[PDB]
Amino acid sequence: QTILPYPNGLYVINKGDGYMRTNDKDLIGTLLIESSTSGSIIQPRLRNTTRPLFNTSNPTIFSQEYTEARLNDAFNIQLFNTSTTLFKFVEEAPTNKNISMKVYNTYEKYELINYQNGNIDDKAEYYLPSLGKCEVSDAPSPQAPVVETPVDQDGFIQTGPNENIIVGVINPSENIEEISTPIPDDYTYNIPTSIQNNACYVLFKVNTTGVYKITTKNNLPPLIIYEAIGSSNRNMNSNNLSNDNIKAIKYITGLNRSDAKSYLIVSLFKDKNYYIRIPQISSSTTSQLIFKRELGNISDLADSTVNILDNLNTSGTHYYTRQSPDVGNYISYQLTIPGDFNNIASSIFSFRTRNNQGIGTLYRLTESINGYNLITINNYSDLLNNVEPISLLNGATYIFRVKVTELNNYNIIFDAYRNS
Amino acid sequence: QTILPYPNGLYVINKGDGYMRTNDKDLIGTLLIESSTSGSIIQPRLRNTTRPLFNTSNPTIFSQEYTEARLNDAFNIQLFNTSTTLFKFVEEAPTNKNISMKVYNTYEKYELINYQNGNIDDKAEYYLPSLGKCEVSDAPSPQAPVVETPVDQDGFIQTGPNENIIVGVINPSENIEEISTPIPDDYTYNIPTSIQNNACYVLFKVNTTGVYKITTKNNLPPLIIYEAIGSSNRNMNSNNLSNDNIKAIKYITGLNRSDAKSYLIVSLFKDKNYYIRIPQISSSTTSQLIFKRELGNISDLADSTVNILDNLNTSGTHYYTRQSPDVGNYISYQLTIPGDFNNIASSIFSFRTRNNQGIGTLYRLTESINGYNLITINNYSDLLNNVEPISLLNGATYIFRVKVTELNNYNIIFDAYRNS
Amino acid sequence: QTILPYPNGLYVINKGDGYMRTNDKDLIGTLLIESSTSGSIIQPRLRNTTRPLFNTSNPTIFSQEYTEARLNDAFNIQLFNTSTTLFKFVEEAPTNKNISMKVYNTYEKYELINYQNGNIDDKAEYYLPSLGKCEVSDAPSPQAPVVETPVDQDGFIQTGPNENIIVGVINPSENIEEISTPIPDDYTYNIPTSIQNNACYVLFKVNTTGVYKITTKNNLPPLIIYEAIGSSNRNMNSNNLSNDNIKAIKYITGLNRSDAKSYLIVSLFKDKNYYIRIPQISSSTTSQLIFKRELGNISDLADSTVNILDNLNTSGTHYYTRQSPDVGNYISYQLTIPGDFNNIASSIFSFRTRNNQGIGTLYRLTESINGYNLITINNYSDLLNNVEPISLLNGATYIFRVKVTELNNYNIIFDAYRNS
Amino acid sequence: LYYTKDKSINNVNLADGNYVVNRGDGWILSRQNQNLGGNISNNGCTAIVGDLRIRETATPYYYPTASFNEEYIKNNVQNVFANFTEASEIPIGFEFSKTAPSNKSLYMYLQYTYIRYEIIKVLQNTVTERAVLYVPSLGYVKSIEFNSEEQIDKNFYFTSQDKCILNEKFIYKKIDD
Amino acid sequence: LYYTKDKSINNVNLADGNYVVNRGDGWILSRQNQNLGGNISNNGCTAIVGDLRIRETATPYYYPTASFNEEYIKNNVQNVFANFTEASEIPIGFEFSKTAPSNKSLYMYLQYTYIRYEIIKVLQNTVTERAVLYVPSLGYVKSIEFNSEEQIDKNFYFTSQDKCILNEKFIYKKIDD
Amino acid sequence: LYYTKDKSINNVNLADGNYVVNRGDGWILSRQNQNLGGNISNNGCTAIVGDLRIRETATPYYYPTASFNEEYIKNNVQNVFANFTEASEIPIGFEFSKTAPSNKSLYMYLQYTYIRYEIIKVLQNTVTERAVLYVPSLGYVKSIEFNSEEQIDKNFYFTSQDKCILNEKFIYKKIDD
C-alpha cells in the first residue's frame, strides 16, 4: 500500500529479478559435489524455448499479448518466450567439506497497471524468464532427521536484489498529434476536433533551451507534460522534429483533476522530445495550447503546476485538493488578492497544507517590463497544520510554492486561510 | 578357475571398467602439450552413436539382443549403442617438461553365463562403451631409438579398477507364479500343474518379519530362495504384494541336487519381495509349498538349507555331497539317531567334511511346546578330515551347522561317521 | 623492391598471418571486463562459412579458382571458404583495473606471382581466413576526450609475426615427362617432340646418392633442376620411381637465359624426387638429357651451373651476364685457355664481377683417368670491381666458382679480363 | 548382491486421507550405478564427465498401486511441485570434474539422480498404501584412487537399495483436502 | 525515470558536406538494460552468462532522417567500415564470468553493446542533420553484491539515455568527397 | 624451401615377406603447417584453438605402390590396428590453450597430426617396397613470442619433410604369416 505520485494512465513496473515459485516448482536440480571436485549446471540453449508466466485482473483487455506490447513500449523487450542467452554455474568444493549446489530457474517480474484517480483499476503481472539462481551450501547429512513439513502457500518469492522501476507508456488507445517544427519562444497550437472524442498527446520540441509557460486558454483543462525516455542524442534535424516512435514516457508535472485551472512552468531542453496530454474536451469551440518562453527567476518554479486560486473574497477556510507531487518536487498556487492596489494589506492570510508535509516559499509576482519577476517574501520549514499569519497587499499577485517532504496521501490539500 | 558358489541359472557379471583392445585399436589419439600449455581431448556427443563389442559361445540363444535383455534385467541398462554422456580430459604441462596426453575409448565388460552343475555351459561377453581413459606422461624424445616390436596377441586388457559383481537374473524361459496376499505365520501353497513341464518361480512376501521354515511336503524336491534386488522402499500395499517387475535376484540359500531332501531356515523381512524356485516335478500328484513362522533360537540357522540325513543304521562311512555355501555362509544337516529314546547313546558319531573347510556347531533339537529349541552341544574349529568322536542319544534329533571357511570345491562333502 | 633470385615460373609466397583490413573492417567486437571478472569471445563454428578476400592483376588467367589450385599445389590447402577450427580468447581482469578486450578476424596472406626475367608480370593476392587476433589493454576512460580523426587509407596491415616463405609450383600449362626407372651412373634421355611446342619438366630419381653432371648435348639450352618438396620418406620401389603428384618444387640451380651454354653439377639423393625443366627447343633434330655420376672433388661445385666461356681469343673485356644465385650459393664459369698446351701462360687473366659481390675460387680442371680432379689455384675475398691479375697455362681448362655474398641486382655479371 | 533390513517405522503425524509428498532431490536407484560408464585418468590430469540430458533419456520410473495409478501420480505431483513433463522439453547440462593426483590413477563414474515423490494413504497414524515416482533430476559422480593390485569395496560400485545422497525430505500436501 | 541536460556543443572542424562517422564500440541503449534477464549466485560460486548471438537476434536500430534514409546509411557505413550484414551470417559467442564472494550474494545482468554510426550534414562549423545507426556488437555485464534488506541505486538497473561504456570516437569519411 | 639427406639405413631384422607396420602417432606432413591459420594474443590473454574434426575434414593420405594398392593398405591396417573409417563417423574434439605473457605478443598455429602406417616388402635384410598411409589422428600447436621487428626462423612456420613430433615406432604384423 504505497502511494504512486503519478497521473492517470498506463505504467509498467519492473519489480525485480530472481522471482521464483514456491515448493521448488522452478528447481532445475541439485548437485552433490565431493571435496576437491567441481560441479557444473548449464542452460546451454540447445532449445530456445522459454516459459513465461502471466496473470491478469482483466483477460479481455490486459491480455498476454497486450501486456507484451506495453513491455515493449516501456523497456523494448523483443523476445518473450525465446532466448539465446546461456547461463552457467561452476562450484569447486573445498578439500575439507562437501557442497550442495542447488540451481533454479528465475523470472523478472513486470507489472502493468491501469492507474486511475490514485487507484489501480486493472493489474497484469508478467514474469519474464531470466538467467537463474544458484545456492551453494555445506552438503547436508544424509542421516539428517526427516522433518514432516506441509507444502507452503502457492505463489512467488523474490530472491534477487530489491528493485522497483516505474516507466509510463503512451496510452495506445489515445492518439498522438505532432508539431513537426521545433517551437519558437511564442507558439499557439490549435487543438483538433478529435479531442471531443478522447484525450490525445501532442509531441513537440523547443528550438531554444529554456523555461516555458504552457497552458490552455482560460487555463482549463489542466495539462500533463512528459519526457520521451531515450530521445536525447539520436537522429536530429535543425528545422524538424525527429520522431523515433518512443512510447516510453517520464512524467514531469501536471494532473487530471478537471477543476484544477492552471498552467505549467517547465524547464525544456533542445535535445529532448516531449509529450503534452490534453484530456477530452466536449466543448464545440476550438481550444488552444499556448507556449511562452520565460526569462527571469520565474524559473524558480522549475517544473511545477501553478494552480490558480479563485473566489477567496469570503473569509476563513479555502481548501484546494490536488494530486500530490512526489517527495522533493513542486506544486504551486497563484493568488491575486481581492481589492484595489494602493499599499493596504488584505485581512491577513495564512497558508497550510493538510495531508502531506512540505517546505513552501511565498513569492511576490511582479509585472515589470522584462518578463515576470519573483521577490521572495518568506519561507516556511513546515506547512502541515501549523503556520504563522502574514499580510498581503490588495490587488497584488502572489505565488506559493510547496516542495513536498512527506507523501502520506495521493492528494495534497492546500488551505489559503483569510483570518480577519 | 574360481569357484562360483551359486545354484543353476543365468548370471550377469560386471567384470569392471576400463577394458580396451590391444594394439591401440581403441586409441583416439595423442596430444603433445608444450610446457606452459594446456591440451584437451573431448568426446562431445555431436553424434550419439557408440559401438559395443560382443562375443558369444552360442549365437542362436545367447544372441546380442538376448544378452542385452539380461543386462537390462540385471543392471537396468537402457542404452547399448547410444550415449548422451560426454567425457573430457584437460592437462596442463609444467614449465619444465613437455607432456604426452594419450586418450583411448574404453568399455565396461559384462559376462552372461548359463551356470549348470558348477559349470559354465554358455558364455556371452558384452562390452558396453564407456567414458574413456587418459594416460599422461613425460613427452618422449623424438630421437628415441626405434625398437622393432611385434604386434602382440589380439584381445582385451583391463585398465580400470578391479571389479567382479555378480547379479543373478530370473530365467525368462521359466514362468513366475505370485502369491498376491502377504503370507501369514502358516501358509500352504498348491503348486500348479505347469510345474510338470518346467521349473517355475513363486513371488511372495511375508506379513510379519521373522524366521521361516520353508519346504515341500516330504521335503522333496529341494528348493531355492532369492531376494528381489531393489524391491525395498518403493510401492507398498498393506494387504497386497506390489509387483514392480524386478528380475534381478540375489541368491540366499538352496540347491539343485535332486536327492537333497531338505527344508530352508531363512530370515525374511516385511519390506522385501522374495522368489522361490521350484524345479520341474514330473509327478502327477499335486505338490505343495509349506511356510511356517519359527519363534525361538532355530534362528541360529539364519539362512541355511537343512539337509535331512537318512539310512545311517549301518556303521562307518556316510557321505553326503551338496553344493557348497560361500565362505561365511551356512549349510546344515539334520540327524534323528536310530533306536528308541530312553538315555543310551548310539555307537558314537564323528562328523567331518571332505572338500571344504568349516567351523561347525552341533545342536540338540528339542520338541518342547513353544516351537522348537536348540541346545548347543559342542563347537569344532576345523571340520576337514580331522574331528573328535561324540556320543548321541538314541531317538534324539540333532542338527549340525557348518560355516564354510574355505571354498576349494563347488561341492562340500559331509560325513556322518558311526564308529563302533 | 627486393630481388627474387629465382628462375622464371610460378611462385606462391606465404607473406604471414595476422593480416586485417583498416578502419576496424574486421573487428568482431570489444568486451569491457570489470576488475575481478573474466570475459570471453568465441568463434564456435556453428556455421562453417568463412569469407576469403582476393585480388588479381589478371582476372582471366589468375582467377580466384586458379589461384586456389596453386595454393593447393604449394601448401596443400584443402579448404578455402570453410573451417571447423574454432578459436577463443579468455581474459581475466586484475583486481585493480578494468580491461578492454578487442577481437578481430584475421587472414593469412598468400601471393601468387608469374615471375619472368626478374620481373613480376602477374600478381594475385589471396587472403585465407585465419584464427583471429586479440588486443587486451587498460579500459579507456569513458570521459576520454573525443578526437576527430579521418578514416585512414583503405587497405591491409599485418599484425602477426614477420614471415616470407616462397614455394615454387610446377607450371600446370607445362607437361611432365617421367623416367620411371631410377637412373644409373650414366644415362641418356631422348627428349620427345612435344618440346618443340612448349617447355616441359622431366621427373626422375637416382639409383645411387652422389654428385651428377647434367647437360644437354652441346650444352644448349640451359637447364633448371628442382627438388620435389616432401617426396622423402613416403612410398618407395627398388626398381621404380614412386610418383606421389607433388607439385611443390624447390629450386636448386639453373637459369633461363637462352645463350647460357652450361652444365649442372648437383648433389642428388636416392630418397628424393627431382624435376628438370627443359625449355622449348624449336629445332627439328632430337635433343638429349645426359646424366653422368661424378666421383672426385668436382663435388666442390655442389649445386651450381657451370657456364662455359667462349671466344676470348681477343683481349680485354669479356662480359657474361647471368641470373645471380642467392647469397651463399654458387655460380661457376669454365675456361679453356687459347693456344696449344706446353707450359707457357696466356696473356695474364683477371677475374671480376660487376653487379653482385662474391668470394670466388680458381680451380685447375685436370683430365687424369679417375674422373676429373680440381686443384685449387687461388681464392679471392672480394670479386666486385677489384681483383689481382693471374697467369694461366695455354690449352688448360680452369673453373672459377663464385659464392655470392651480396645480392644487389637480379643478374650477376662476370668479367674474364685478358690484360696483355 | 546385498541388502539391509526394515521391521517397521511408518508413523505419520497427520489426519486421515491421501497425500502427495516430495521426498527430496538426490535419490539414486539400485543396480544402475555404472550404466553410463566410467572414466580413468592419472598423474595430474583433470577428468570431466557430464550430460546434456534431454526428453528421450530422462526416463521417469513409476511404481503405482491399487488406488494410485500413473496418471493420478503425475497430475498431483505436477500440480503441486515442479512440472517435469514441461521441464523435460528444455535441455539442461551438468558436469563434474576432478584432478587425478600426482603419480596415481583415478576412476570416476556417473549416474542419474532423481527426485522421489510418494503418494500415500494414511489412517491417522500409519501409511496403508504408497505409490512411488522417481523424476530424473541431475547426476552424481563417485570417484576413487586405484592401482591394478587393489581390491575395491562392492558398495563403491553397486547400490542394492534406493537411497538419497542428500538429506531425505517429507514435504506434504493433502489431496482433496 | 531519469534524464540529463544538453544546451549546445555540436562544433565540427571540417568542410561543408556529408560524412559517415564511426562513433565507437561499446554503446548501450536506454531502457533495455535488463531485457535478457539476470543471474544470482552466492558463497564462492562462479556465475557465467553469455550469448551466441546470430542474425535473428542481432537487430540493428536505424534512426533515419530527411536526407539520409536507411539504405543510404547502411551502404555508406558498410562501404567504409565493417559489413555487419555479412558478419551477421556467422555466429559469434561471448560470455562473462564472476565469482560470488564468500558469505555474500551476487547479482549479474547482461545487455547487448553496439557500434554507433552517424551520418551527418555540416555547414563548415556545425551539424545541421544527423542520422544514427546502432549495429549490434557484443555484450556487457553489470554486477553488484546484495542482500534482501539493501536498496540499490536506480542507475545500476536502468539507463535512460544512450551512452558508451568505452571512450567515444569520431572517425569520419567525407561521402561524395 | 628446404630439405635433409638420406644415403641408406633400411635394415629390418625379420624374415622374408610382407608386413603391416604402425609407425606411431604424432606425424606432421610437409608444407601444410599453417593451412588451418593462426592466432594472435597479448598481455596476459589466454588464447585457445581447437577443432571438432569429423569425417569430411579427416582426409587420409594414401601413397600406394605396385603390389600394395589403397584397398590392400586399408584392410590390413584396419584389421590389425584401429578402424579409422568406423572411428571417422564419431566426432572427437581437441583444443590447446596458452596464456600470452605480460607486455608481449603470442602467435600460435594449428595443424593436424597423423598416425603413419607402412606396408613393406622385405628380403631377410632390407625393404624392397614400401607403401605409406597417414591416418588423421589429432592436432598440434606451435607457439612463439614476437614483435614487429623480429625475424623468425623458417623452420618454425614450415616443415619440408614429414616427421614425427613424438618418438617414431615400429610395431609390425606379418601378413599372410
Swiss-Prot record, chains D, E, F:
Coiled-coil segments: none
Protein name: Hemagglutinin component HA-23A
Residue span of region HA-22-23 domain 1: 1-177
